Design a protein around this ligand. Structure first.
Ligand code: FAD
Ligand code: FAD
Ligand code: VK3
Ligand code: VK3
Ligand code: ZN
Ligand code: ZN
Lengths: 230, 230
């Protein structure tokens, strides 16, 4: 049996370092004989806003709209917006979910944040109780491929931007692990725009190279200690 | 003389605890005689996507689209989308910027993330010469008024969600401090949905009451130590 992979891609320019790191993952994983699917959010013009338009049935409480309550109900009633369910299908079948994106304000670009806000709804990605170790999407793997504007030094404990693991907390722990995902070590391609053509090629190569043995990797200890190191 | 406050509001329902917190802020601040403006993102159906549409006119390089470069150029060129500039006019005139939003995946809702991604562009919010303590928007105050689903205990250093100061890093340090803002201690109305009518009123009341002396408040030492250290 093989593996299914979903690459949530968030970048406007196809000729970008992000586009390349995505094409690379597709080429490599496909070469391995893996089933690959890519969600080019910008190309799809994915709706980032969480509104009442995400529910197609009668609202539970039309007087006071509570997005969480409504989407949770909609998911169970199979009345969620189509674009939401489409992504949920790809995630449900995936064994590995890779997020390819440029660092936007120490987090993910708005279009990607919307993906996470609307797709990973209650009932699908988690329950109460049913998060973190017992998240509904448990068993699946997750990996963040982030390119940055700042350099590696900038992202050290004593660096101006602080340790890179600090901003990974919301994404890796608060989102991914919360949904049950097993987080693999993030892939951070530091300051490509500053790097030389050769250094860039090295970063792209390093990605492909790592992917060759991606299925043999063990997930990181998604704990507060891993991110902050007390 | 006088004070200007911009409240970037991010919530779908006017009858929500978030709507109430925003309304109260408008009340107290207006009572104080302050100049108050509110950006109801959802009502405005604000565009969270950072696309080429954000630039009006000829792109500096239409062959390869680089958002940060295109926008920075468009800012200096006065070729940015009106919806972005409008928000920039408000921010530039404000003395205090309050963000009212529910916690979405240890961060801000996608619509709000978009506001931060598109409005706080290079040339306006920051620039190679100035960031963090030398950020372009230096001198201005900033405050995050966030409501959470999880209780306070869940947000302790030894809790499931970890210390609240952890998820605040990317927002307070990575975004606000990066632009030069003076970050005031955040206001976190923990699990309002779970709280009793009595407890909630206490949360709302604490919000307005705090607003009475906001101008006498000292900006928190936005350091890594503050967020993670002891
Ligand atoms: C809204 C916003 C917020 C931001 N927030 C942050 C932040 O919080 N922290 C931070 O550090 N940075 C930040 N930045 C910067 C952002 O992280 C970088 O712009 C981004 O990571 C760069 O990646 P890119 O794909 O856009 O690269 P590109 O601009 O495409 O640069 C890559 C270069 O490599 C070339 N190239 C493409 N493919 C290949 C290939 N296969 N081999 C060799 N060369 C190739 C490209 O053509 C180009 O010359 C922000 C920028 C914006 C617009
Ligand atoms: C995509 C998504 C991601 C999420 N991620 C997180 C996360 O990372 N962490 C986390 O902890 N939670 C998370 N949540 C939950 C979210 O943080 C909470 O649902 C939200 O903060 C609750 O705030 P609210 O304004 O919607 O409250 P409401 O649902 O409006 O509840 C307030 C209650 O008080 C009533 N009320 C209204 N006005 C007043 C008033 N003036 N005085 C008294 N009572 C009043 C309301 O009608 C209601 O009964 C997430 C939810 C979603 C949809
Ligand atoms: C927040 C931020 C930090 C960077 O180091 C950086 C470097 C180069 C371009 C943009 C950015 C940016 O927006
Ligand atoms: C991450 C997260 C944590 C909560 O405590 C919570 C509570 C109620 C609804 C949703 C959430 C949520 O998404
Ligand atoms: Zn974790
Ligand atoms: Zn800071």
């Amino acid at each position: 049996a093989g593996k299914k992979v979903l690459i949530v891609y968030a970048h406007q320019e196809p000729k970008s370092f992000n586009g390349s790191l995505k094409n690379v993952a597709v080429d490599e994983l496909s070469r391995q004989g893996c089933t690959v699917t890519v969600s080019d959010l910008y190309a799809m013009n994915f709706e980032p806003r969480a509104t009442d338009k995400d529910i197609t049935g009668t609202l539970s409480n039309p007087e006071v709209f509570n997005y969480g309550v409504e989407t949770h109900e909609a998911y169970k009633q199979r009345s969620l917006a189509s674009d939401i369910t489409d992504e949920q299908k790809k995630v449900r079948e995936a064994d590995l979910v890779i997020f390819q994106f440029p660092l936007y304000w120490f987090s993910v670009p708005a279009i990607l944040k919307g993906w996470m806000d609307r797709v990973l709804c209650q009932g699908f990605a988690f329950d109460i109780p049913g998060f973190y170790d017992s998240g509904l999407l448990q068993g699946k793997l997750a990996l963040l491929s982030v390119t940055t504007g700042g350099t590696a030094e900038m992202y050290t404990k004593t660096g101006v931007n602080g340790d890179s693991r600090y901003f990974l907390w919301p994404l890796q722990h608060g989102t991914l692990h919360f949904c049950g995902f097993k987080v693999l070590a993030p892939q951070i391609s530091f300051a490509p725009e500053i790097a030389s053509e050769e250094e860039r090629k090295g970063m792209v190569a390093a990605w492909s190279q790592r992917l060759q043995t991606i299925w043999k990797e063990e997930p990181i200890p998604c704990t507060a200690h891993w991110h902050f190191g007390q």
